[PDB]
Amino acid sequence: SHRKFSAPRHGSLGFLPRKRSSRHRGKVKSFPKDDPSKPVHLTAFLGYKAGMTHIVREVDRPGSKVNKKEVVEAVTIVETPPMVVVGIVGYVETPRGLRTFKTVFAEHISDECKRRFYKNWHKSKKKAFTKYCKKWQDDAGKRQLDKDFSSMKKYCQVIRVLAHTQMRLLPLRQKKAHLMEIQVNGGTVAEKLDWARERLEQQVPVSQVFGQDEMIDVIGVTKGKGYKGVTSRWHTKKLPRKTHRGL
Amino acid sequence: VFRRFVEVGRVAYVSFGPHAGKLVAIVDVIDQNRALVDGPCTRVRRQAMPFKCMQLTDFILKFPHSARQKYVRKAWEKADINTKWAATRWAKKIEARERKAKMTDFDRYKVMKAKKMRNRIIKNEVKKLQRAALLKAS
């Protein structure tokens, strides 16, 4: 027999493998679609959730009851120290997808970013990129690692810069700096890469990524609440008091 | 557009069947897909024959659609079809097709020894011509 009383189903099936996220850093599944008309700009940034507070502002929407009245609105502070760019990576469109092509790192990268390549920074001897950084200080390597920019300016469609947070400046216990590919959306691929190889091993602040009163998207992992029950997770109806094996 | 038309009096080479390899002449188109043919000078008897087996040459010889084999032979050897067929590039590349099938082992050896030198002489000429064109470019 059917349901006597129809009712919409609990939960959404679009978010269905409700598992622990494999990543701690929120990952951008799709950067904004590129077009060669606009000037070059980063399209993502990282920040840290500080907390919540109020706002009072005067609203200007002609038609509401709250035009030229003043609401309060909850807001969230995200501390965003300027992120240090430490590499680029290119991507070639393939019939099987979009393959990475040639990752090129900077010369001097900081040892808060070097923490990321080590599961145990104490026991290690800090040997990462030591044989790689010596390519920047000889002509045998300089003509090697600018010939590949010349191949990235031929065969890559998507150039994504490779930045990292600067966790020296944060109040946290952690020092291992998160790092992120940020897609550079701008002119041709030559302009797009000869913009970022000067941003290589230097700062990028927030104010030349975003602006005021712009809508953005927040990527991140939720506050974990543990192994919880079906009425706590899926919000199904609590069975009545009289039930024998739990309600 | 089209160049070979099935009509009264076109010579047709025959692909397969019992009379494969013989020219024939269309007398009268019986149906959509079968036709009354004969070759009075190529040893193939007056009969019907479908269009699935006959390939059309560009030879028309003129005789009426009810004419008998006595008068088809006259318009055959008038136009002299049997020598014009052997002079065609068609029959030369069916005759050179069957010479390679007739080729024995000693003939296959002699052909191998001939082409082993003839390709080398051609290639030694071609790689003189290539650098001659390159010195012309230079």
Binding site: P95 | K93, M103, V111, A114, K115, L129
Partner: protein
């Protein structure tokens, strides 16, 4: 010892019915450019058939349900493994010798690829019937790489024409050299013409 089949203008199951048998007879088959496989019947019947195949998901776990491959090469792969006995290990060792490719990748772009006349649209459909492109069907049933593979194939065509112009040039140098050499290869040619190779 590796058979490279073209895929343009071949009927889907009519090509698969002989790819399956050459694969079972131990012959390593790589078919290529499965974009231009065309299916008979019109496009709307074929799209309705593939959407009906998309409707066939296992009710309790569609992840365990039938994997509806959207790429044209893997549509052709699944329609070969329908024809192969893929449960048995000879069918599994058969499917390991079929290698499908969307477009023509660089292992096989500079290799001469073969055409089956016995599975081909202009031979096995009468010309007033209307067929259906597997590339367009796979695209607007959810294969994401039509335009990418189309630009890469256009890049391959504008380079294969550079190859073919040089091949024409070499053949013209050859047939202009042969008249220069016909006085000294007059007796090397004559024994070829008497054995049916150069007339």
């Amino acid at each position: 010892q590796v058979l490279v089949l073209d895929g343009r203008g071949h009927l889907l199951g009519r090509l698969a019915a002989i790819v399956a048998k050459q694969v079972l007879l131990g012959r390593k088959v790589v078919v290529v450019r499965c974009e231009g496989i065309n299916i008979s019947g019109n496009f709307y019947r074929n799209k309705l058939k593939y959407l009906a195949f998309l409707r066939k998901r296992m009710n309790t776990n569609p992840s365990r349900g039938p994997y509806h491959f959207r790429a044209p090469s893997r549509i052709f792969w699944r329609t070969v493994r329908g024809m192969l006995p893929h449960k048995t290990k000879r069918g599994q060792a058969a499917l390991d010798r079929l290698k499908v490719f969307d477009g023509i990748p660089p292992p096989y772009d500079k290799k001469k690829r073969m055409v089956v006349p016995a599975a081909l649209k202009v031979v096995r459909l009468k010309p007033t019937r209307k067929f259906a492109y597997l590339g367009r069907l796979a695209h607007e049933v959810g294969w994401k790489y039509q335009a990418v593979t189309a630009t890469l194939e256009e890049k391959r065509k504008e380079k294969a024409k550079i190859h073919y112009r040089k091949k024409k040039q070499l053949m013209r140098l050859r047939k202009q050299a042969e008249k220069n050499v016909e006085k000294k290869i007059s007796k090397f040619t004559d024994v070829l013409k008497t054995h049916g190779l150069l007339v």
